[PDB]
């Protein structure tokens, strides 16, 4: 029960991310009931989540949390329903979660956010069809791009190229970006709408994307391998930290799956009773995998390697 930490946490757990030492960051939204808002939580004890009484730090946000990500070890970057991108930071003692800035630049819900390689900049996507590049130090928008024609579903930064990142929208476009080019967007080719993106950690030109129909595909920049992993939309794709990494896939079918290098299934968990929203691999125990969902469950899976 830390100070200025809410006594009750929102039901719809939206995001879960581990940092270096192994502490767990949680994002929750109130998607029903009287108040529609969100909260941020830090659990240095991953097995104690989602219990608020045994958390390290917590704070409330003015609106819901559609997406978040770490910014280093003490920074938390948040995509708010209010159209604002927010940056929170832990104090020196890591008992509070203080707001750094709250800038309202998107005209609709901010749906996705991602931190570039240098850690000094971030890219955001929103239902306002726009994609913005942020200067985390100056707390301003460096660029506002409008390449899509529908709402942006996901934006994912390149692991080592600070000017490269991916984005997918419901206009059926997957755009490869590079702010070094006069026209930074480039389309990658009829299929179903893409819904999730994940760069390959050990291959600069390789990434995977899921569609609204449950297919996970493996793509290279220039010449395709795909497998029907889920019966509904593919929500998230997160690679494991192993040398030859595994691929965890999420879906609205309330099921987690782990895939090998050839998109073949190795693990399967139906422990969730609602949508599965995020997944994060433990840095301490590379075989452990933690997922969260709207059923308010925080499951710690043992993935057989």
């Amino acid at each position: 029960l830390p100070p200025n930490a809410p006594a009750c946490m929102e039901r719809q757990l939206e995001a879960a991310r581990y940092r270096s030492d192994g502490a767990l960051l949680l994002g929750a939204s109130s998607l029903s009931g009287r108040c529609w808002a969100g909260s941020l939580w830090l659990f240095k004890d991953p097995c104690a989540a989602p219990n608020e009484g045994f958390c390290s730090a917590g704070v409330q946000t003015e609106a819901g949390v559609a997406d978040l990500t770490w910014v280093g070890e003490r920074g938390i970057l948040v995509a708010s329903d209010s159209g604002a991108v927010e940056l929170w930071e832990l104090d020196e003692n890591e008992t509070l979660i203080v707001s750094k800035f709250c800038k309202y630049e998107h005209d609709d819900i901010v749906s996705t956010v991602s931190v570039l390689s240098s850690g000094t900049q971030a890219v955001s996507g929103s239902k306002d069809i726009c994609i913005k590049v942020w200067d985390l130090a100056q707390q301003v928008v460096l660029s506002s791009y409008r390449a899509h024609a529908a709402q942006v579903t996901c934006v994912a930064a390149s692991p080592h190229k600070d000017s490269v990142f991916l984005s997918c929208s419901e206009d059926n476009r997957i755009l490869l970006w590079d702010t070094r080019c006069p026209k930074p967007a480039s389309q990658i080719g009829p299929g179903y709408l893409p819904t999730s993106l994940a760069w390959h950690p050990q291959q600069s030109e390789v990434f995977v994307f899921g569609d609204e129909n449950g297919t996970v595909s493996l793509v290279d920049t220039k010449s395709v391998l795909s497998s029907a992993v889920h019966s509904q939309c593919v929500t998230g794709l997160v690679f494991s930290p192993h040398s030859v990494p595994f691929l965890a896939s999420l879906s609205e079918d309330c099921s987690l799956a782990v895939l090998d290098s050839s998109l073949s299934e190795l693990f399967r968990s139906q422990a969730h009773r609602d949508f599965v929203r995020d997944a994060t691999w433990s840095p301490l125990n590379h075989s452990l995998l933690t997922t969260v969902g709207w059923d308010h469950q925080v499951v710690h899976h043992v993935v057989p390697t």
Binding site: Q12, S29, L31, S32, G33, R34, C35, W36, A37, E62, A63, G64, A66, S80, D81, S82, G83, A84, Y104, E105, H106, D107, D108, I109, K127, D128, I129, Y145, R146, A147, H148, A149, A150, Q151, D171, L175, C181, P182, K183, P184, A185, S186, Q187, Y192, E212, N213, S231, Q232, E252, D253, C254, R273, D274, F275, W294
Partner: protein, 625 residues
């Protein structure tokens, strides 16, 4: 005063949000009734059995607040026309669920998007909801002037934006709306929420929405420019569109976050109030005609029917009309009586259809200023108005005016007339049987007699107006032909409409008619060039008349008698709308038919597509002789 609303896709607390929106100056608030990110399953387990509540409680606002302050919004994830079947099923049930919750709340309006070409299943679900009960709730279809794909930044290297003009492609959003409402069978509860973009399209694209049932205009904060003092303003072209929308009296909606963070958020709304106060006030006519916009009226038949007292009062509240009459009488007296005969020659003036006597007074004032002697007859067949004339004649006019309570076609005049004055004209000139009445009175006009008016001509113009078509469509009555409302004209102050071509003359009549074989039947073929794409719903009618020489009365817009309140335009509808492409010619045919009892109009469209012949044998509409 401008009626404006605030659009939000994020409401943490209804009480707090609605209070802040009201304090800023808005009248209503567009918010989602479910959480826009709260995707809900309906078929597959275990996600379908998600414990409730599914959304906020209705107790959070009073029934009055839900009825007047809230506009619902369909959730963005609901795509009834998705190519994935599971997404369709869930979207169909969710659309019914959200719509039914809005009707449960008694919400006055619900917003639904038109963001793509194929909304066939979206229309089916909405049409199903409309036919599930008896409700008056409005459905605002959010549709942009420019489709998003056509306004995206030219920043994709291997997929540039086209620079060559696509005259029809730039009008694709209107086709989205047209097909949608056509599938929905022109439901009266389905209106347009036109979303204005940063870059306005070509004028023809904006002119597409002329005559469309636009109920709301959505102005994103992104389109507002910035002046020297940092306040949000609009380009002069945007201001032009705002003024046209203020005439339709649409409700404006502000969407998007505050991009002028220095100024408080009510700066956008204050600018709309600013633009509204800066426009010309009602100029006499618009002060009189306001309230009658697109209001259908049955054309008066003053021959078959006897007009009420307050109908004559409407005729008499237009001095510009009768000063034209007086001036016509003034010029005619001087041309018929030379100066040396000013005292010996007394002209016989006969007002044919005097009503309550405004023409009689105009005749008296004309003879005075012309310094000539006149003998006045006031003919009127309406005995109730004869009461007004005879009390006038006893108290003021005296023996100079002879009131005759008789039909001008049957009255046996004791002498022949030098000048006959009449006001037997309708919105379509001859649609009150002025030719038939003056033909029967022609015998007691001297061989060199002058008829005022001397001639009149009717004009027709093809118009586009989905609202007026719907207004006509809603005039079906229980015990007659189900399509009779489409085969009769209406007198209406045409407001929300688009005239597709310059009006052209239709029928013309001259008085006196010296021709030996008098035939008032007519048959006229007109070809109207159309330089746009549109949907033809009917033909507007006007008229011009010559009182004497150069003195005229006119409701034809290009020659409209300035300052004349009398006579609204007339409207001839067609049973079925007709698509017209750019460059095509609309060809209409009109007949003036008659027998011994009745006179009526028949009309047909022959190009680019044939319509049915309307009002054959006057089965739906006749004008009694």
């Amino acid at each position: 005063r401008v009626s404006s609303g605030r659009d939000l896709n994020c409401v943490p607390e209804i009480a707090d949000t609605l209070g802040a929106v009201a304090k800023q100056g808005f009248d209503f608030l567009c918010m989602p009734v479910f959480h826009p990110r709260f995707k809900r399953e309906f078929i597959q387990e275990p996600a379908k059995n998600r414990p409730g509540p599914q959304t906020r409680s209705d107790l959070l606002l009073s029934g009055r607040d839900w009825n007047t302050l809230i506009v619902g919004k369909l959730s963005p994830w609901i795509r009834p026309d998705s190519k994935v079947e599971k997404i369709r099923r869930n979207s169909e049930a969710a659309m019914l669920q959200e719509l039914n919750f809005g009707a449960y709340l008694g919400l006055p309006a619900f917003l639904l998007p038109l963001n793509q070409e194929d909304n066939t299943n979206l229309a089916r679900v909405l049409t199903n909801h409309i036919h599930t009960g008896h409700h008056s709730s409005m459905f605002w279809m959010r549709v942009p002037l420019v489709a998003p794909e056509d306004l995206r930044d030219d920043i994709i290297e291997n997929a540039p934006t086209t620079h060559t003009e696509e005259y029809s492609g730039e009008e694709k959003t209107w086709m989205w709306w047209h097909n949608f409402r056509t599938l929905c069978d022109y439901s009266k509860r389905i209106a347009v929420a036109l979303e204005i973009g940063a870059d306005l399209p070509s004028n023809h694209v904006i002119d597409r929405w002329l005559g469309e049932p636009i109920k709301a205009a959505i102005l994103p904060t992104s389109i507002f420019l910035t002046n020297k003092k940092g306040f949000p303003v609009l380009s002069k072209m945007h201001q032009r569109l705002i003024f046209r929308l203020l005439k339709l009296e649409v409700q404006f909606i502000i969407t998007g976050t505050n991009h002028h963070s220095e100024k408080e958020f009510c700066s956008y709304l204050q600018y709309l109030e600013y633009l509204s106060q800066n426009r010309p006030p009602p100029n006499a006519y618009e002060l009189f005609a306001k309230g009658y916009e697109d209001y259908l009226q049955s054309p008066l038949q003053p021959l078959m029917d006897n007009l009420e007292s307050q109908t004559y009062e409407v005729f008499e509240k237009d001095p510009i009309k009768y000063s034209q009459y007086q001036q016509a009488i003034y010029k005619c007296l001087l041309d018929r009586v030379p100066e040396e005969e000013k005292d010996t020659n007394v002209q016989v003036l006969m007002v044919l259809g005097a009503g309550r006597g405004p023409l009689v007074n105009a005749s008296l004032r004309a003879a005075k200023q012309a310094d000539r002697r006149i003998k006045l007859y006031a003919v009127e067949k309406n005995p109730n108005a004869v009461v007004t004339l005879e009390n006038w004649q006893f108290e003021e006019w005296g023996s100079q005016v002879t009131v005759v309570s008789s039909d001008m076609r049957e009255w046996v005049a004791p002498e022949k007339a030098d000048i006959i004055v009449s006001e037997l004209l309708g919105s379509f000139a001859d649609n009150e049987l002025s030719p038939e009445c003056l033909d029967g009175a022609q015998h007691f006009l001297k061989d060199d007699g002058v008829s005022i008016p001397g001639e009149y001509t009717s004009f027709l113009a093809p118009i586009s107006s989905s609202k007026l078509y719907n207004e006509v469509r809603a005039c079906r009555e229980k015990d007659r032909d189900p399509e009779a409302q489409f085969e009769m004209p209406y007198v209406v102050r045409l407001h929300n409409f688009h005239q597709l071509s310059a009006p052209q003359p239709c029928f013309t009549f001259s008085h006196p008619n010296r021709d030996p074989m008098i035939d008032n039947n007519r048959y006229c073929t007109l070809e109207f060039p159309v330089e746009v794409n549109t949907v033809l719903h009917g033909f507007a009618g006007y008229f011009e008349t010559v009182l004497y020489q150069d003195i005229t009365l006119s409701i034809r817009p290009e020659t409209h008698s300035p300052g004349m309140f009398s006579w609204f335009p007339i409207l001839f509808p067609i049973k079925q709308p007709i698509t017209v492409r750019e460059g095509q010619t609309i060809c209409v045919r009109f007949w003036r038919c008659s027998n011994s009892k009745k006179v009526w109009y028949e009309w047909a469209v022959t190009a680019p597509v044939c319509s049915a012949i309307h009002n054959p044998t006057g089965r739906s509409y006749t004008i009694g002789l």
